[PDB]
RNA sequence: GAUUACCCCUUCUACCUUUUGCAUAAUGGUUUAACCAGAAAAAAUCUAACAAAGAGAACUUUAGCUAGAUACCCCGAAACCAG
RNA sequence: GCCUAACGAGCCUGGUGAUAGCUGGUUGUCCGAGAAAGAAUUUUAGUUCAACCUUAAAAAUACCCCAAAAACCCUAAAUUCCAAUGUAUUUUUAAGAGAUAGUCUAAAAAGGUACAGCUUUUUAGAAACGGAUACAACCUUGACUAGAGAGUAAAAUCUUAAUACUACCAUAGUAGGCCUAAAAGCAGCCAUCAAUUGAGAAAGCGUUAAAGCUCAACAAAUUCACCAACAUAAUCCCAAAAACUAAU
RNA sequence: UCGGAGUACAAAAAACCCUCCGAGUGAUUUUAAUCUAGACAAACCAGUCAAAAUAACCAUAACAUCACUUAUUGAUCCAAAAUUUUGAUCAACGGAACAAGUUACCCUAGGGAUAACAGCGCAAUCCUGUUCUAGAGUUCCUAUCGACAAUAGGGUUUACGACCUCGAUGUUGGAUCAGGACACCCAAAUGGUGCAACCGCUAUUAAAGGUUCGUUUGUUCAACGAUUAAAGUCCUACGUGAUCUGAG
C-alpha cells in the first residue's frame with residue numbers, strides 16, 4: 005500500500021459525509037409538481053378554428 | 056420404534072450484546088444454560104442465569120480470577136484441591152457506566 | 166485479431182479505441198469548413214474528462230491525508246515537550262543529597 | 263460448507279525478483295490503481311457480486327481508478343480473480359485545469375495529458 | 381449425490397480436473413544428458 | 419438469411435396447458451364464421467369543494483368532512499330433497 | 502334380479518347458476534420493477550401468518566467492515582460483532598397480492614449397499630440465442646434497437662500400451678549325532694565343524710532309505726537387466742481424416 | 750405434546766419411520782407480596798428475565814430449595830364455585846361439545862404429485878472373468894479343483910428408487926414368424942491332461958447352418974418315456990393379442 009492503515013484513517017471523511025448529505029437532499033426534494041394555467045387553459049386550443 | 060421424542064427447538068442461548076456495544080439499564084447481555092460468562096461490575100444475574108445490565112453504558116468482556124463464595128460447598132472443594140500456585144480464571148461481563156450519576160443545577164437565587 | 170501485438174506497441178487492443186482511426190473527424194465540407202462534431206467523440210471527451218478529474222481528486226485526497234497524519238505526529242511530539250516545559254521543578258529527593 | 267475464504271498474509275509478501283518482473287519499484291509503492299473487471303460475477307457468490315458493484319467495476323473491460331490505500335486493497339483482495347490491476351503512470355504528471363479536455367488513458371496504463379496537438 | 385469418501389474413484393468437477401492437469405509435476409530436464417557427457 | 423434464380427446452401431426440437439423438468443411417445447385442437455369468461459368501494463391512494471368544521475335532516479370530526487375515480491371470472495360431478 | 506335399451510335403487514320437473522381445496526378454460530399493444538418456502542393447521546392437492554417482493558410516502562444511515570471481544574478436555578473450513586474506506590443503500594409509514602407440491606452442480610453431514618437421475622438438513626451456485634457433437638442444473642457471459650465494422654471469452658482427437666537372460670563346472674571326513682521299519686544334504690529335534698585354489702553337515706527337485714538332476718564354490722568370463730502386463734451382449738462400425746513450411 | 754446429548758466441531762437457527770437418554774412429578778419448609786424502567790424470545794398465541802419504588806418482616810430484612818432442573822403440561826367457549834377460584838391421556842397434546850366397520854355391487858373428481866406391467870437409474874442379491882495360494886489331488890499348489898481374501902466387468906433374477914406414461918404404454922403361458930448376442934449344446938480347427946486306445950475332463954479360436962417327439966402341470970421351470978450330431982445360455986415392452994389362443 006501507499007499509505008499505512010493509520011495514515012488513511014478519516015483521510016477522506018469530509019467527502020463521504022458530503023455525499024450522503026447530497027443523497028438525502030435529493031430525496032427530500034420529492035414533491036408533487038407545480039400546476040399552471042397554461043395547461044388547463046391551453047387544452048381549449050383543441051377547438052381553434054379558421055373563420 | 057425404539058427412539059422417540061428427540062424433537063425440541065433451540066433455546067437461543069447466546070450472547071446478545073457484544074464487546075463495545077452501548078446498553079441501557081435492563082438490557083439482557085447474555086442468556087445461558089450453564090455458567091459460561093459470569094456477571095461482573097454493574098451486571099445483574101437473573102435466576103435463570105442470564106446477565107443483564109444494571110447501568111447505562113458500554114459492555115466489556117474480561118478474564119478474571121475466580122474466588123467462589125464460602126457458602127458454596129462444591130466450589131470451595133474445587134478450589135481447595137488445587138496445586139499451591141494455581142488460580143481459577145473465568146470470563147466476566149461488565150458495563151462501564153456512561154452518564155455521570157447526576158448534575159448540580161441552579162434552582163433559585165435567593 | 167492481433168491484440169497482443171497491438172498492446173506491446175502501446176496502442177489499444179481494439180483498433181476502434183482512441184487511435185487516430187476513431188478520433189479524427191471523418192468528414193468535412195468541400196469548402197473546408199469543419200463539420201459539426203461527432204456524438205461518439207463528444208461522449209468520449211466527457212467521460213475521459215470525468216476520469217481525469219477523478220484521478221486528480223484521489224491524488225489530492227491521498228496527499229492531504231498523508232500531510233494530516235504528519236501534522237498529527239508533530240502535534241503529539243510537541244505535546245510531549247509541552248508537558249515538560251509546563252512541569253514543576255522536582256525538589257524533595259534531590260535537596261538532601 | 264462453501265464459505266468465504268481467508269487469504270494468509272504470506273501470499274502478499276513479495277519476493278525481490280517480482281519487482282524486476284512486473285516493473286514495480288522496490289523502494290516506492292505506486293499511488294493509484296487502474297482496475298478492470300476481466301471476468302463475470304455470475305456463478306460467483308453474492309458477496310463478490312457486491313464487492314464488484316461497490317468498486318464501480320460493474321461494466322466489463324472498462325477501466326476504473328482507485329486509491330492504493332489498505333481500505334481498498336481489502337476488497338480488491340477478495341475479488342482479485344475477477345479483475346486486472348495495473349499501476350497508473352503519469353509521464354507528463356498530473357493534469358492541470360487546462361489539460362482536462364485533452365487527457366487520455368493508454369493501455370500500458372499510462373495517462374497522457376496532451377492528446378493530439380494540431 | 382455421493383458421499384465424500386467412496387469406493388469407485390468419483391469423477392471430479394471439470395474445473396478441478398483442469399487444476400489437477402495444470403499442477404502436475406514437471407521433472408527438471410538437464411541441458412545435456414549426463415550419460416552423453418564425458 | 420438470402421440469392422440473377424422456385425428449389426438446391428445455411429440456421430432453427432410446432433403452439434397451448436401442466437410441470438423440478440415437455441420436441442416429447444404428457445394435455446387440447448380437421449378447418450372457417452358467429453357466439454363464448456373479473457362483478458362489489460370498509461380502510462386506503464389520487465383529484466376537487468368547503469374547512470375547525472363538512473354534508474340538500476338523521477351522521478362524522480384533536481384537519482376534518484363531502485364528492486368523484488380506482489376491485490374481486492367461465493364450464494363441469496357423483497349426490498341430496500320435494501312433488 | 503326385475504320395475505319402458507345405463508336400477509347398490511326409475512324417470513321427469515322444481516329446489517338449481519346445488520357444491521367441488523379437484524381438472525380444464527380466461528380475449529388489444531407497448532414499457533417499469535419481480536418472486537422456491539420459517540410457523541401452525543382432520544394439515545402437508547389447501548389456507549392464514551412471517552421472511553422476501555410490488556406501488557406510493559417519510560426519514561437516516563445502510564451494506565463492506567482492522568484491531569479489541571464471544572467456555573468450560575480435544576477440535577477444521579469458518580461465523581458473530583464492529584471503526585475506517587469504498588460505494589448508494591437501508592429503515593420506518595400506508596397499501597397490496599402471489600408464493601408456501603424444487604431440480605441438478607460443488608461443499609459439510611446423516612440414512613441406504615462408503616447403490617442410485619435415491620432420501621433428509623446446512624453453505625454456495627445455476628437455469629445462453631456462445632461452449633461441453635446432441636444437453637436444464639457444468640463452463641463463458643452486467644441479456645436494448647439498427648450496421649454488408651472491430652477486439653476478446655469459454656471452447657474442438659486423452660495418454661500410455663513395457664517383462665530375452667544362455668555359458669561353465671561338481672571330488673573329502675560322512676550313512677555327522679539322535680527318535681523311528683527306514684530318515685544316507687534334503688519326516689522331524691540339536692550342533693553346523695572340517696580336506697582341497699575351491700564346493701552349505703545343503704537352497705530347490707527326486708528316493709521306501711539311496712542313487713540321481715540342479716543351485717550357490719572355484720576357475721572362465723564379462724552390453725544391459727528392481728517393479729511393472731487383466732475377456733465380454735444383444736437392429737448396424739460409427740464424422741472424415743492426419744506423426745512437421747515456423748502457434749502465447 | 751414437552752425436555753437433555755449427538756446430528757448441528759466456534760453467534761443463533763436447522764431436517765429425517767435419524768442415534769441415545771428422559772417428562773405427564775415427587776419431597777421439603779425458606780409459604781415464596783404489590784407495582785413498574787428496560788430487555789430476551791417470537792408468524793400469531795403463548796413463553797422468559799428484571800433495576801428503581803411501595804408494603805411485609807432483622808426494625809436501611811423479596812432468587813423457595815433438592816432430585817442431570819431443563820421437562821413435569823392444555824387456548825377459547827361452557828360449566829360448576831361465590832369473591833375468588835377450580836375443571837380435560839380435549840395424549841390426534843393450537844384442542845370439532847357428541848359419530849365405527851365394510852364394498853370384488855360400487856360411483857364421481859383427479860393423480861403418473863403415487864403403486865401393479867414395461868422402460869430407465871443402481872448393482873445389495875445374481876453372473877462372469879482374471880489376482881493370491883493355504884489346502885484337496887497317494888507324492889505334487891494351479892491335470893482337475895481351491896478356503897481366507899483381491900481386482901474388474903456384465904445387466905437374466907429378486908429387490909431398491911419413483912424419472913416417462915393413470916383424458917389407458919391391455920398383463921402369464923402357448924400358436925405363428927422369428928431379429929440379435931456369444932458367455933458354443935452340435936458341426937469345424939487346435940493347446941493341456943492324473944491323454945496308451947475308446948471314452949472323457951479342461952482351455953483356445955470360430956456364431957454361415959442347426960438345436961426332436963410325447964405322458965402329467967394353465968403353467969415357465971421340474972419329473973418321466975423315447976430319441977437325437979445336438980436337444981445351448983440369453984436379449985428383443987419377461988420379442989410377437991390393430992395376427993391367433995384365454996387354460997391361468
Ligand SMILES: Nc1nc2c(ncn2[C@@H]2O[C@H](COP(=O)(O)O)[C@@H](O)[C@H]2O)c(=O)[nH]1
Pocket residue numbers: 827836837846
Ligand atoms: N373438562 C372440560 N370439559 C369441557 C370444557 N368445556 C366444554 N367441555 C365439554 O362440556 C361437556 C360436559 O359434559 P360431560 O360430558 O363432561 O358430562 C363435555 O362434552 C366436555 O367436553 C372444559 O373446559 N373442560
Ligand SMILES: [Mg+2]
Pocket residue numbers: 061062063
Ligand atoms: Mg436436539
Ligand SMILES: [Mg+2]
Pocket residue numbers: 062063064065
Ligand atoms: Mg425443531
Ligand SMILES: [Mg+2]
Pocket residue numbers: none
Ligand atoms: Mg454506442
Ligand SMILES: [Mg+2]
Pocket residue numbers: 381382
Ligand atoms: Mg452432495
Ligand SMILES: [Mg+2]
Pocket residue numbers: none
Ligand atoms: Mg412429474
Ligand SMILES: [Mg+2]
Pocket residue numbers: none
Ligand atoms: Mg410452480
Ligand SMILES: [Mg+2]
Pocket residue numbers: none
Ligand atoms: Mg428440451
Ligand SMILES: [Mg+2]
Pocket residue numbers: 442443913
Ligand atoms: Mg418421451
Ligand SMILES: [Mg+2]
Pocket residue numbers: none
Ligand atoms: Mg410423433
Ligand SMILES: [Mg+2]
Pocket residue numbers: 440444913
Ligand atoms: Mg412426458
Ligand SMILES: [Mg+2]
Pocket residue numbers: none
Ligand atoms: Mg396419455
Ligand SMILES: [Mg+2]
Pocket residue numbers: none
Ligand atoms: Mg402431443
Ligand SMILES: [Mg+2]
Pocket residue numbers: none
Ligand atoms: Mg394428465
Ligand SMILES: [Mg+2]
Pocket residue numbers: 434435445446
Ligand atoms: Mg390444453
Ligand SMILES: [Mg+2]
Pocket residue numbers: none
Ligand atoms: Mg386429439
